[PDB]
From Swiss-Prot, chains A, B, C, D:
Biological processes annotated in GO: antibiotic biosynthetic process
Entry protein name: Non-haem bromoperoxidase BPO-A2
SUPFAM superfamilies: alpha/beta-Hydrolases
EC number: 1.11.1.-
Complex and partners: Homotrimer.
Catalytic residues as annotated in Swiss-Prot or TrEMBL: 98, 228, 257
Molecular function per GO: peroxidase activity
Family from the record: Belongs to the AB hydrolase superfamily. Bacterial non-heme haloperoxidase / perhydrolase family.
């Protein structure tokens, strides 16, 4: 699979990518000089944990196009922007490794955390690798990095051998945490890259990310191995942690630079923990908003309390039976049809195991919108706008411009499956629908 | 007249209804097995007392469609909801009889007292007719009602005869409080209903309204005859009063179930009294609304206080001289001509005993405004709509769509008596006229 | 069938009506408290006599809407005007009974005798029922009529029983001129009316029609029963006859107020006689139009005179032989085939005793229209239009839009019995066919 | 509810009708001089037995328009044709009573048994009522029927009293099988009819249906009471049975003419029996055709036998669980996806209790038709044709003109509910789909 991110001469610039699993999107950005396949230990684990795993190869790396231009983090982040927008990812988590951490920082800084839910930095470059007067916490001076580039140019293939020696800390880990064959594969992947990209990449390492750091508002994770030879812990993660004190800090003892493979177990644990915490965190702040809006239309009484409890339960993950819930709704007294319709919409949307229940008659007739063609016309016009929308807050504002009658029909369009909108947008509509009704 | 409330197969479900008189809306919901025309003695009285009478026939009864589905109080209340929304009734009073009391209870409970000002329950079913363990205050057990259903199914035409015998307490009241011809007509109305609806209706009588009662927040009236054979006073109204202590309780001595006709005099008296309280309450809220809107355009000062006092005085009924007020208005400094015009319009409209005073020059020239032909044309365009309008809330809503200049000219059209609109509508215009001026 | 005559609140005011038969329009306006179906004995007779019978129910009566407004003869006459204009009746005869006579007088006075050919007053109210100083020939004073209204308000259903007792003179006529079942039905019709209309109607009875009477210029008929209890002959018809001496005066001895049923034979005879003078007058004007049109296509000579004579003879009712006429037509040397066809069509259409004569070959071959499939298609399109049509002038106008070739084939459709149109419409077609031929 | 069947003058001719329940359509055609409501004893029973009950009032009867034309069985049958086509009824059963039997015979004869599944004749007129030389088995001569018409014309209301006396055999059945009130209601219904229609109807009774009888190919039922006074058993049903020996013959001992009410229990039993037998009979001949076609695509083996058995079971009414069936299908080896798709389509279509199962992923992906827009285009073109189609044999022929790929997508359109076609047509498509696949 490919995504076009540019054009170089007669050819176009496409990035190889992979989209696996179902759930919240987790984007994995590889490091030098490998490819998306490097994440295989994480990808396998993330898929088991019910996530949607998205990986892609940086330009001039792996199966991606190998142009001779655009090897800078402004272009790298621009490419990532294309990827996220092309796939239209929302509420996604960015995870970067080595070079990949730079892309995360720059994108967040340059494009905003609209589509972003959280960020993770594994074996980070941040904040600044270059050792200068203004930055004494740098790893090495300019002359040093110039040596690396010249080494790659000398013999690209022979360079890789020595590179992976310190990448994995082979003297320690070979035969223990990484096999001979595994390294062999890493080398093949390295050779598979672009000759130009190979020597162009090291110049990007001394990028000044110090200005990018403050723009990080989403929850963050900083992971790094103490035995990191490529990017010394004290010149990278430790000073990075001072720049971003809010971030969850994890130091893996004795882990090398390529800890993604060697210390995969420690990495997965920390990562899956951070993801699960950030996931439940964004569910609660979103669902409590949905709860208050939905409860706003239900008349005060013992029934209102009963509804709120069952709502909290499904939100908590207490997967209650849906056939029972829908029947409880259907046979419930004092509930208005529209209220039953709205709740029916919410329950099918929030309940995981859909079990296999047909779009209920009582829900469809509530959402039909009396059969007014004027209501059906406004509903489609709104549906077009919601297809473009991504944020929950953004979806509610544009929906509020429409009448309560038009909103009900729009919900009906989606429920009947004549419409395909994201859950965050779907929640925006229902809350906006509740808001208009609440003002009556 | 019909209102579509649903659809059954190839056919649609329409309810026959009637809309008479001008004033506060009073919805009359008939009982089994009659129709809206049963209220004729109350309707005649209510029309004389300056109310807006709305009656409709339940599905499968009278002139309404006779479907073979939807014979439950959730469907009955949904039908009522459609009627109220179709007519866009606001600050209305619901009055139910026999089965009709169930509709009132369920609607208020399920849809809220948004459009409702007050409720009345005559010969109520509430709270629960069924005699069970948890409900010993029931009138009769399950087996009994099963007998009635089977009795109707056996021969509904023969059933009606025996039914009306206890409905009117004919051994007592025939030839005294009800004539043979009156009963004869009632029988015709009964037979005119649906065969299915006839046997489907008794199953609804043992509905549990105990959960619906607490949701009644609007002022309530509970009326019931002591000689009620169909719905025994102690198993219905008396225990209903314990559930709803706020309600005005009236016990009509020796009255049967069909007291609407037999004891019509006692019923009208009690009902019109209860209604008058709700009527005078919203009349006052109308004048306070006009006051606040009119005062909104007057600039703050001692003159504003002076105007507000004279406004309160005329609203209170204090016979102020009109020639004096108008001469006072004409000679006031600080006041804009349009402001003087609006006030002049309000004063001629509200001040009693106009004593034959010719249309003031200063008011006519004030309302003319710009002299813009767009203002003049739209004013006539608006005037046509206002002649059809009847409600204050309805008149204010449609008037707001017009520019402030067009509204001023529209008031001028009416002032020159080239127009004839009701006082409630006239007030809608001035408030809308005041609203536009304040918002610029 | 309904005709909208106004609007009351959310509902519209529609009048139930019936349009039967083909010929000169006869409008039958019922009295209190019945409906259009009351004329059923007259309608049956009038339909036999080849009239177009139009009946409608007054507002709040029979199957018409039951509003609580517009119960005055100015509104009643306005409704009648709407009916006449909606149906676009021309040269029609108005026949009124009881209350219905008031509508006739008022409409004629207020709207003019433009569409009216003649008028009839059966059991009239005219000229003035109220007994005052200026009008001593009144039947009863103000106080009396106030009693009737109060009587209806007390119990309209019980009122109906006592009303029909004097309406039909049951002590005399029951079991002789009117059956128990017939009265039963009359009672049902009364109860079916509006409760408001019932008590509102009597106040209209003492309307002053004295100024309306002189405005009657069309030929008039005044019929009344001597045994009329409701409207005493001397206070009504006798003084009415002095006001309108030109009118044809008929006094049915011993007939009650509801003589329409009891003395139906005497009523029908008198009515059909008066009507026949106006009907035969309009039949001739139709036939003279057809004659001029048919003769228009025949070339000048002795033959033209012969045809005109034979046309006058069949129009006059002189039973000429058809077998002879057709053989005479077939054998003419200077007559065009189309001309022979048209005349043949006319003769079969106008000759009563067709005597079982088979569809002539020579006429069929003339009307076939050269068997052009294009001509045959246009003829069917016209036939569809003529199937909806009823008037002669209306049928002629829409036919003129078609080519002479298309018209001839359409006549062929009807002649061959592949088409079914009324005689008035059929004449419209033939006249339209002649007009096109005359213009070449 | 109304259906327009014609036009008379300014008015249109509409028939009042009722459509209740879900299942195979059973049309109930009332007799003289009643209306559709007369069937109430049958309608209640048929609805319990899960049928779709359709009743309508003949022109000039009940709530239908009352024109003065078209009172002949060619027009009556034309009206019935409009009703069946307007509602688009297919595989329906016609049931006639008294006059209603004539409509059934004529429609079948004139319009064919395309939409008809079976026919029933209760208290039939057939074959010929008129007593002449050529028909000695007639009930009465011409002069006799002329007497009946004149009796109605004499006094329509008084006629009904004597009519219902022999209609129900009141001397026997009154107070036993029919109540005083029930007859009263029948009289009201009689009076409700048209005055013209009342006297016009008896002339239709001596219609010669002898030519209509042979055209009856669908299964027939002839029911008649021996105590029938109106239509003597020997002059009607007995000679009718000789004309139609294939018909199921039922003689109800001592039943009068209006046995629909009096002997309702005996009538329902016989009728529900005949319907159930004719219903299962048309299911078997249709389903065995579906079975052979569906099995044609399944490869021979033990799986083929297993499928056939489960198919026979669901066809027999052995309502097996659908969640289990679909899971059995999904987890079944050797079954192709398209085969699983086709079977999935058939099972959801044939299984009554849908239970509430979502359109399965495995079924949708099989029916998608690879996503070719050309296949989706042809599928819609076919869908338009199938919407017009009614017969199973008719639906298969027009579908065969389309490719197997286009057919699969068309089935997918219906399954996803983007399409609404009748079950007989739906079966035509699947069989046609199987036929194309079978030829590969």
């Amino acid at each position: 699979p490919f995504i076009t991110v540019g054009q170089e001469n007669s050819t176009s610039i496409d990035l190889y990518y992979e989209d696996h699993g179902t759930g919240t999107p987790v984007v994995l950005i590889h490091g030098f000089p490998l490819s998306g396949h490097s994440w295989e230990r994480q990808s396998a684990a993330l898929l088991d944990a019910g996530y949607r795993v998205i990986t892609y190869d940086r330009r001039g790396f792996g199966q991606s196009s190998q142009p001779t231009t655009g090897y800078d983090y402004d272009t790298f982040a621009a490419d990532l922007n294309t990827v996220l927008e092309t796939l239209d990812l929302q509420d996604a988590v960015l995870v970067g490794f080595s070079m990949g951490t730079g892309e995360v920082a720059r994108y967040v800084s340059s494009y905003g955390t609209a589509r972003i839910a959280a960020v993770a930095f594994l074996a980070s470059l941040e904040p600044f690798l270059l050792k200068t007067d203004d930055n004494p916490d740098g790893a090495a001076p300019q002359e040093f990095f110039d040596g690396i580039v010249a080494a790659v140019k000398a013999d690209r293939y022979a360079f890789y051998t020595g590179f992976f020696n310190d990448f994995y800390n082979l003297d320690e880990n070979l035969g223990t945490r990484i096999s001979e064959e595994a390294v062999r594969n890493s080398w093949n992947t390295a050779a598979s890259g672009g000759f130009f990209a190979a020597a162009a990449a090291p110049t990007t390492w001394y990028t000044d990310f110090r200005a990018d750091i403050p723009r990080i508002d989403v929850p963050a994770l900083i992971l790094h191995g103490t035995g990191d030879r490529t990017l010394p812990i004290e010149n990278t993660a430790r000073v990075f942690h001072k720049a971003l004190p809010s971030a969850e800090y994890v130091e893996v003892e004795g882990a090398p630079h390529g800890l993604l493979w060697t210390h995969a177990e420690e990495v997965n644990t920390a990562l899956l923990a951070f993801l699960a915490k950030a996931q439940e965190a964004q569910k609660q702040k979103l669902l409590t908003e949905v709860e208050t809006y939905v409860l706003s239309i239900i008349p005060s009484g013992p029934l209102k309390a009963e509804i709120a409890q069952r709502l909290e339960d499904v939100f908590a993950g207490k997967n209650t039976d849906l056939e029972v819930l829908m029947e409880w709704l259907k046979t419930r007294p004092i509930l208005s049809p529209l209220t039953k319709g709205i709740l029916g919409f919410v329950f099918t949307l929030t309940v995981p195991s859909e079990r296999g229940l047909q779009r209920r008659r009582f829900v469809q007739n509530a959402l039909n919108g009396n059969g007014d063609p004027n209501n059906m016309d406004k509903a489609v016009k709104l549906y077009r706008k919601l297809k473009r929308e991504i944020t929950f807050h953004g979806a509610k504002e544009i929906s509020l411009s429409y009448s309560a009658g038009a909103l009900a029909s729009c919900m009906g369009l989606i429920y009947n499956r004549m419409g395909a909108v994201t859950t965050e947008v779907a929640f925006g509509l229902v809350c906006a629908t509740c808001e208009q009704i609440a003002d009556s």
